[PDB]
């Protein structure tokens with residue numbers, strides 16, 4: 001069940017400069033996060049062609065945030081030449097295509113890197129339990145397209161396309177404890193998500209490849 005070699009994450013400084021690599025496990029231990037260990041990540045927000053946002057629910061088997069709802073795909077570029085590539089954020093866009101297939105079963109041809117749009121970067125920290133957490137500079141990637149979903153149940157328990165109002169209702173259910181959402185998704189929904197969603201045809205104003213936002 002466990003792979004022979006551990007997956008590697010890209011270690012970065014607070015300015016998103018590559019400074020090394022560490023195992024996925026080590027990158028997500030609270031004890032290391034508290035020493036400042038920070039890694040590169042991405043977060044895909046995919047909208048269908050009626051502007052419904054695609055949410056995933058993480059499988060109960062995931063190490064961090066099992067069973068939690070979040071946006072379309074939250075994962076990491078690998079520490080290899082393909083995904084280390086920083087020109088036009090190609091590395092993270094390639095990573096996103098890779099994980100859209102692995103997690104949601106979306107064929108590669110449906111989401112080529114060229115159609116994955118890099119908006120901005122957000123630096124955040126979160127805790128999952130007593131052992132595990134998150135600490136990332138997260139590339140925000142936006143997609144609007146109809147895709148064919150066949151998730152790997154080992155990765156994804158369910159998915160849901162939500163309108164703005166449906167999301168608002170879902171967040172109410174999370175607040176009452178009826179369902180679980182990741183700390184990332186909670187904070188992004190509270191800060192930027194609806195601003196982007198109200199402006200899907202005018203996103204250029206939100207493109208910022210210089211400033212790294214903090215939340």
Ligand SMILES: [Cl-]
Nearest residue numbers: 024025028063
């Ligand atoms: Cl992990």
Ligand SMILES: [Cl-]
Nearest residue numbers: 032033035037
């Ligand atoms: Cl460390």
Ligand SMILES: [Cl-]
Nearest residue numbers: 050051164197
């Ligand atoms: Cl809309």
Ligand SMILES: [Cl-]
Nearest residue numbers: 106107108109
């Ligand atoms: Cl494919």
Ligand SMILES: [Cl-]
Nearest residue numbers: 114115116117
């Ligand atoms: Cl384009």
Ligand SMILES: [Cl-]
Nearest residue numbers: 157158159160
């Ligand atoms: Cl489903």
Ligand SMILES: [Cl-]
Nearest residue numbers: 174175176186
């Ligand atoms: Cl909540």
Ligand SMILES: [Cl-]
Nearest residue numbers: 126182183184
């Ligand atoms: Cl999170």
Ligand SMILES: [Cl-]
Nearest residue numbers: 051199200201
């Ligand atoms: Cl629209």
Ligand SMILES: [Cl-]
Nearest residue numbers: 202203204205
């Ligand atoms: Cl604009």
Ligand SMILES: [Mn+2]
Nearest residue numbers: 061062063066
């Ligand atoms: Mn567990």
Ligand SMILES: [Mn+2]
Nearest residue numbers: 073099100103
């Ligand atoms: Mn995915």
Ligand SMILES: [Mn+2]
Nearest residue numbers: 041074136138
């Ligand atoms: Mn993240």
Ligand SMILES: [Mn+2]
Nearest residue numbers: 085086087088
């Ligand atoms: Mn380059």
Ligand SMILES: [Mn+2]
Nearest residue numbers: 124125126215
């Ligand atoms: Mn936090």
Ligand SMILES: [Mn+2]
Nearest residue numbers: 123124125135
């Ligand atoms: Mn930090």
